[PDB]
Please model this.
Amino acid sequence: FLRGACIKTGDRFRVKIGYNQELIAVFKSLPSRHYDSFTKTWDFSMSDYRALMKAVERLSTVSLKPL
Model:
């Protein structure tokens, strides 16, 4: 099951799938974190990449494709 949201962009719209509680907790632990409230997307410095991937490997409810 997935919960997501439609995001209006002019006369088009995007469909964005939401995060979960665990993941957001990881996100807020990272010093370079940025949330885009328009796109509903989190981004980070590459300086936080290894830390993110390391925290997520410990979460049984999240799996992320490495860049």
